[PDB]
């Protein structure tokens, strides 16, 4: 197999990684193996210490959520964690010089998602990401240089779970003005799980035993992002738009399918929206949905991404001229779009570089 | 009808004319009850300004679909119609009063062409506030009280209370505005049988509404104790909102009805627009969560946005 | 932008010697730790020799007391010496800094006759 490198920028310093993310199941999250080198003859009264810091930054500033710090150092605690199997291969090869770290990320913590920057935005990241550096320094408050130390960048992702669950669908009954029979809407999905790039179906039986005909329908597919700094707020990302010229006569059935496609192509001008962690300037697909315990919230401090298709059936309010006159039937279809389980570390640029 | 009196003496006097070849009182009235003029019309200016901007809020908002909020957006249609009538009916009078100063009574063209339709609407306006009083009350009645239905099968009579009653019985007042009276803008006190078909369609709201207010006070009170989860939903809230509204606003014109009094009435008119605004639409409690809600959205945004490192590298590993 | 350029190499009898050296531009090695890599057929990278700047030299166990090895500041070069070559010992020889930094080359290959 193959491992990963991160040279200090003054060839003293050097930290390998045997892959890049890591998986972050419902209750724990896999975790950080790695092993740093220091040359001889540049550990005397000197100490190694390695860090897990994870920061949403903010632009041109950052808040740290996620710190946990383990020394490396020659001088070694008398409580020695034990040692993986990849951290015990990388001994042998790179030698007794060979300073193993673990690290253990705590469960229920925001996963490595980032935000389109938009057209007049710097290259400033404004999505939340994992970090991993190495440095030599007396102590914790002694100053670290950038020249003197490693910037590896590293990144948490979920895949989809293998146990399919229920079938989505949604129920309303929209009462007209005083006197009218009932409005029925059906709309529901052969699936909740999607993978990326899978094409998207909703089903639709409505019938309308009214005199108010019906306009065109809507369908639209909407992501979630409940950015959370300080206060809890929530935006809208209309992905998918279909556009339905068709009709319902008055005291008349209908039923009809429509097929979406979720993806960026056609949302690049568009800003806010959730894409999955980068670690560089290279693009990546619309960020998958956040599988959470449900428990409790808990103020996660970071960014949850969520789907759901709407339909929406407007009235034309038949009767008087009721020109401007529009009411708006809608539910809401949840949903979760998110990776296969792989069999092979993803590389993290465009598989054809364009260079 | 002053003014008229000394302009047909005049005339009359030059005709035949031509043929035959305290001050004290006066600066105390017009100085004081400026004062008083001003008093009110503040009052009234900031509660439409008030009414107007609870409205825009309740309809600009997705809220509106439940009809439990939506009640109020149309109660307050009343307030502001009334708030703009008082307003309107003043600036007109100033006007054709100053015109007739500075701006021999014959020659002005124009003194109650609006005034005739100010008037009635003025007096739409406050026999429609009382009698969106009683609709809140009854409507009150099924949801704390005993039922089955859902809010639904009785919007339809609703909009025939609220302005239901000053179809039928302002109408008549409409006519004998004209009729009997013509007085200059069909607003004068020759007689005092004409405001008993007025005073009495608003004297009916408030004692219907006592005879509700007994009864719902009790059936709350009563059922309290047990399993009502004060102040935990909804339930409680239209309680307290609702409850103060009804006698405060009844026994305003009560004990008016049974210049120190002149005074205190219309301070308390005034500021009745702005009494019914934040107890309906800016003391409630999900409307004032979800406002913070979008100020928040707000503020998030602008934070977000505002307007020799080698190379990763790889090796070998022996398996 | 930095390359890693040597010389040396050709069929040389056992216990022979040769004067295996290497030049490095761009990053200079006033202070960090320079090492020369050994390769095996088939096999992976391992390291037998590593100077410092301060003449604290070590060597591999396997090829203990086998040579010498050393480093000059001036043109930046560091020399590796060859004494009682053994037939095992016939691989490509590779220079690199102790932490697998700097471009890894390919350099030339040495074997006895």
């Known amino acids: 197999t193959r491992v990963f490198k991160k040279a200090s920028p003054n060839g003293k310093l050097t930290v390998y990684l045997g892959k890049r993310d890591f998986v972050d199941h419902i209750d724990l999250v896999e975790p950080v193996d790695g092993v740093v080198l220091v040359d001889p003859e540049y550990l005397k009264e000197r100490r190694v210490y390695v860090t897990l810091t994870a920061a949403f930054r903010y632009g041109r500033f950052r808040k740290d959520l996620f710190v946990a710090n383990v020394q490396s150092f020659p001088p070694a605690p008398e409580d020695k964690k034990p040692l993986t199997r990849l951290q015990e291969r990388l001994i042998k090869k790179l030698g007794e010089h060979a300073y193993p770290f673990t690290f253990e990320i705590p469960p229920n913590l925001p996963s490595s998602v980032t935000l389109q920057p938009g057209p007049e935005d710097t290259g400033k990241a404004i999505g939340v990401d994992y970090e991993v550096k190495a440095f030599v320094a007396e102590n914790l408050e002694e100053k670290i240089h950038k020249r003197n130390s490693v910037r590896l960048v590293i990144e948490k992702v979920q895949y989809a779970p293998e146990r399919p669950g229920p079938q989505p669908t949604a129920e309303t009954t929209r009462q007209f003005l005083m006197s009218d029979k009932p409005l029925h809407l059906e709309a529901s999905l052969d699936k909740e799980i999607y993978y990326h790039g899978e094409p998207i179906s909703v089903n639709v039986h409505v019938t309308n035993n009214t005199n108010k005909t019906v306009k065109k329908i809507k369908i639209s597919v909407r992501q979630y992002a409940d950015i959370v700094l300080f206060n809890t707020a929530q935006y809208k990302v209309p992905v998918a738009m279909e556009e339905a010229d068709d009709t319902v006569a008055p005291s008349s059935t209908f039923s009809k399918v429509y097929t979406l496609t979720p993806f960026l192509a056609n949302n690049r001008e568009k800003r806010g929206l959730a894409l999955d962690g980068k670690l560089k300037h290279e693009d990546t697909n619309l960020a998958s949905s956040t599988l959470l315990r449900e428990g409790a919230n808990r103020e996660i401090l970071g960014i949850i991404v969520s789907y759901k298709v709407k339909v929406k059936l407007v009235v034309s309010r038949g009767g008087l001229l009721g020109d401007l006159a529009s009411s708006d039937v809608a539910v809401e279809l949840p949903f979760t779009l998110m990776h296969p389980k792989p069999k092979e570390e993803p590389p993290h640029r465009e598989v054809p570089e364009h260079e | 009808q002053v003014m008229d009196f000394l302009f047909e003496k005049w005339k009359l006097y030059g005709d035949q004319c031509h043929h035959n070849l305290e001050i004290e009182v006066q600066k105390e009235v017009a100085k004081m009850y400026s004062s008083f003029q001003v008093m009110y019309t503040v009052g009234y200016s900031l509660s439409l300004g008030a009414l107007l901007l609870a409205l825009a809020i309740l309809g600009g908002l997705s809220k509106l679909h439940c009809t439990r909020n939506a009640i109020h957006a149309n109660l307050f249609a009343s307030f502001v119609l009334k708030a703009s009538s008082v307003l309107v009916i003043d600036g007109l009078l100033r006007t054709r009063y100053s015109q007739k100063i500075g701006d021999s009574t014959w020659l002005s063209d124009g003194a109650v062409a609006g005034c005739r339709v100010a008037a009635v609407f003025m007096q739409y306006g406050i026999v429609a506030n009382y009698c969106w009083l009683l609709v809140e009350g009854l409507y009150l009645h099924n949801l704390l009280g005993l039922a089955t239905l859902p809010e639904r099968s009785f919007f339809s009579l609703y909009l025939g209370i609220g302005w239901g009653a000053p179809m039928l019985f302002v109408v008549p007042w409409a006519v004998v505005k004209c009729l009997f009276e013509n007085v200059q803008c069909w607003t004068s006190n020759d007689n005092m049988g004409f405001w008993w078909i007025l005073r009495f369609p608003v004297f009916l709201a408030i004692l219907i509404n006592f005879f509700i207010f007994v009864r719902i006070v009790q059936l709350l009170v009563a059922k309290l104790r047990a399993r009502q989860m004060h102040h935990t939903d909804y339930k409680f809230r239209l309680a307290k909102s609702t409850l103060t509204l009804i006698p405060l606003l009844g026994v305003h014109e009560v004990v008016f009805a049974f210049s120190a009094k002149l005074f205190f009435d219309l301070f308390l008119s005034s500021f009745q627009g702005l009494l019914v605004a934040v107890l309906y639409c800016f003391l409630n409690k999900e409307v004032q969560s979800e406002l913070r809600r979008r100020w928040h959205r707000w503020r998030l945004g602008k934070v977000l946005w505002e307007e020799e490192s080698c190379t990763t590298a790889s090796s070998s590993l022996a398996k | 932008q930095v390359q890693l350029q040597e010389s040396g190499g050709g069929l040389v009898q056992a216990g022979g010697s040769l004067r295996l050296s290497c030049v490095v531009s761009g990053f200079f090695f006033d202070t960090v730790t320079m090492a020369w890599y050994r390769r095996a057929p088939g096999k992976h990278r391992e390291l037998v020799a590593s100077?410092?700047?301060?003449?604290?030299?070590t060597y591999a166990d396997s090829v203990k007391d086998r040579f010498t090895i050393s480093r000059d500041n001036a043109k930046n070069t560091v020399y590796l010496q060859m004494n009682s070559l053994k037939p095992e010992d016939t691989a490509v020889y590779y220079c690199?800094?102790?932490?697998?930094?700097?471009?890894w080359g390919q350099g030339t290959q040495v074997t006895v006759s």
């Open positions: 100077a410092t700047a301060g003449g604290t030299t």
């Open positions: 690199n800094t102790f932490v697998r930094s700097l471009s």
